[PDB]
């Protein structure tokens, strides 16, 4: 009735960066994530919540805020997720300070927090990081703003707790064809969901129960994979 | 409500972190046998370097604890150590999200051999003797989440199960190991996706699907 | 528990040898058309079976009775049905595997209509074919491969020492130049 495709080598899906501004895909940003540099004096370091608190205090900021653990764990589950195997989403980190980060969907996030932090300080001072084969820069700090990096046909929502709840399967089936999605998550420890409410349209909720950013990201990932049959 | 092993009737989900690497050491007090904190000491002990990783246990634990079905109170966590130690984890505790306090909590668990609340009404973390069937309920189905088995859509499977036939899901939290460890316990092996996943994302996918079939 | 096409060919050939004493089966290439079995079989259960008692049959076979050929025929029947239930029911090509064998034994029944072990062979053949499903193959299916991933990078002595010495030379010469300029002015 209809021929099979000519070649049947199961090829890798086409890898994606932001330079493609056409293909329908998914993008997750981590908003207000805390990744801060400091120079202890004889070593630069990433600010960490538990171990250094009085030096946070002598700087004067809030130990209730300065915590990259949730960023690391959310990043781990996202870039581990099976849609990231299917090659259909990429990561944008919008720091608490303001730096744009494009994370390629081919990197392998270091599993332990110390290695992750060492990578992070190398990034935040160096601006680019190459692979072990050294021909592709996997991490790209880039220029504000993010909507001047996104694809053209996108809808932009935030993930808030107070918002009315929907089924993300329903939402992705409500979408149009070339209309990609753009979900802003709040990776703050404890703060108000007012970060990108001039950027994006509408707020969304996934339960009447509060979550973490991590399990919210997992919920959105699996609603995505069920909506796209992958 | 609070779901304990003393309840043994209604529909629930029980997770098994099988052979999860959790070893402690005595330097002069205790330290967890984390890989990256010290590898030369592991070279001396002969236990291979890339096999003891309790941070993966931490990630799976955070995932199961902050899953929405935990807020629905419908799961409970059983850890099987590689050295014969059952640990029951209750559905209403906030395990730390920081690795330092987490590893300290592991060493103090491993040499207090029980954890109760200072609220002192019910326990938080329990150290009980294996096998697991002693606490596994009556109408219990035991399924390995294995990569080689044919995959099955979670919604169809959860609804294909009966009402009171409760479910126990087995995941080997290790980095690498041959997956025929759970056979003397499990009913059957099922796959979930075409790709080598992670334990954490597999457990999250399963609780999300169960969430969908029970409409939380 | 494997398969041998040479065995199925053996069955084809040997049964046509016992029928020929051609037009229905010309895809066969028989050898000695003569030594068939005419219509004189008594087919009692007291006839000689396999009797795996070898050289007494082997070195003296040539003086053929009807009885020894009947015996080697029923040996063939037993061997066929045994490896049928051992392998050939399980194999996926079962259907057109057993098509011409079914032809052969139905020809024996249309010839004689007397044996019952061939008759029950035919019956179990019908049961196995009515039983099995015979779907086309699905050999070519593969799980989708993922993306290639990578690993991040983060943390020549004499050449770098030459570098640092050159920086020190430049810095010192410029500094002394500044000093000489100031004092002279």
């Amino acid at each position: 009735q209809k021929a099979l495709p000519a070649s049947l080598v199961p090829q890798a899906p086409p890898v994606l960066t932001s330079k493609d501004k056409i293909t329908k895909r998914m993008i997750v940003v981590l908003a207000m994530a805390s990744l801060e540099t400091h120079k202890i004096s004889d070593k630069y370091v990433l600010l960490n919540c538990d171990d250094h608190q009085g030096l946070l205090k002598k700087m004067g900021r809030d130990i209730s805020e300065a915590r990259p653990d949730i960023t690391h764990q959310c990043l781990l589950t996202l870039l581990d997720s099976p849609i990231n195997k299917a090659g259909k989403l990429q990561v944008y980190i919008q720091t608490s300070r303001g730096i744009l980060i494009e994370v390629n969907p081919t990197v392998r996030i270091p599993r332990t927090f110390k290695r992750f932090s060492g990578l992070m300080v190398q990034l935040l001072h160096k601006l680019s990081i190459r692979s072990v084969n050294s021909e592709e820069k996997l991490l790209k700090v880039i220029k504000n703003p993010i909507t001047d990096h996104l694809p053209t046909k996108c809808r932009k929502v935030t993930l808030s707790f107070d918002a009315p709840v929907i089924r993300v399967q329903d939402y992705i089936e409500k979408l149009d064809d070339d209309e990609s999605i753009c979900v802003f998550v709040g990776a703050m420890a404890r703060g108000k969901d007012n970060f990108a409410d001039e950027y994006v349209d509408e707020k969304v909720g996934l339960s009447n129960y509060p979550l973490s950013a991590s399990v919210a990201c997992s919920k959105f990932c699996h609603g995505a994979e069920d909506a796209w049959n992958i | 409500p609070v779901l304990t092993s003393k309840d043994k009737i209604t529909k629930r989900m029980i997770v098994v972190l099988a052979m999860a690497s959790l070893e402690t050491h005595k330097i002069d007090k205790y330290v967890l046998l984390n890989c990256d904190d010290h590898q030369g000491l592991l070279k001396k002990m002969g236990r291979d370097i890339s096999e003891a990783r309790p941070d993966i246990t931490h990630q799976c634990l955070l995932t199961l604890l902050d899953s929405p079905i935990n807020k629905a109170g419908k799961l409970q966590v059983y850890i099987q150590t590689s050295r014969g130690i059952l640990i029951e984890v209750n559905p209403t505790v906030r395990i730390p999200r920081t690795f330092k306090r987490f590893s300290g909590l592991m060493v103090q668990l491993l040499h207090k051999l029980s954890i109760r609340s200072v609220n002192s009404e019910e326990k938080l973390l329990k150290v009980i003797k294996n096998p697991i069937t002693d606490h596994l309920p009556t109408k219990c189905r035991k399924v390995t989440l294995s990569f080689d088995a044919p995959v099955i859509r979670v919604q169809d499977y959860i609804e294909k199960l009966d009402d009171d036939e409760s479910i126990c899901v087995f995941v080997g939290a290790m980095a690498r190991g041959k997956d025929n460890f759970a056979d003397e316990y499990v009913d059957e092996k099922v796959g979930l996706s075409n790709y080598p996943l992670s334990a954490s994302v597999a457990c999250s996918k399963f609780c999300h699907g169960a969430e969908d079939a029970w409409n939380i | 528990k494997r398969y041998i096409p040479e065995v199925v060919y053996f069955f084809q050939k040997i049964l046509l040898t016992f029928i020929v004493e051609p037009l229905d089966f010309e895809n066969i290439r028989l050898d000695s058309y003569e030594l068939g079995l005419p219509l004189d079989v008594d087919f009692t259960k007291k006839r000689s079976t396999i009797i795996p008692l070898h050289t007494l049959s082997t070195m003296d076979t040539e003086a053929h009775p009807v009885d020894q050929c009947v015996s080697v025929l029923l040996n063939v029947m037993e061997s066929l049905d045994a490896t049928i239930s051992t392998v050939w029911k399980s194999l996926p090509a079962f259907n057109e595997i057993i098509l011409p064998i079914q032809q052969l034994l139905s020809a024996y029944t249309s010839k004689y209509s007397d044996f019952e072990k061939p008759r029950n062979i035919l019956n179990k053949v019908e049961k196995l074919t009515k039983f099995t499903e015979h779907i086309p193959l699905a050999l070519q299916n593969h799980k989708p491969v993922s993306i290639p991933t990578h690993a991040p990078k983060y943390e020549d002595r004499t050449r770098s020492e030459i570098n640092k010495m050159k920086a020190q030379l430049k810095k010192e010469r410029k500094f002394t130049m500044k000093e000489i300029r100031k004092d002279a002015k």
Binding site: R111 | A175, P196 | T149
Partner: peptide, 10 residues
């Protein structure tokens, strides 16, 4: 190659 395994080490 790498699939839920970790990293290399120097």
């Amino acid at each position: 190659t790498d699939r839920f395994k970790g990293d290399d080490d120097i």
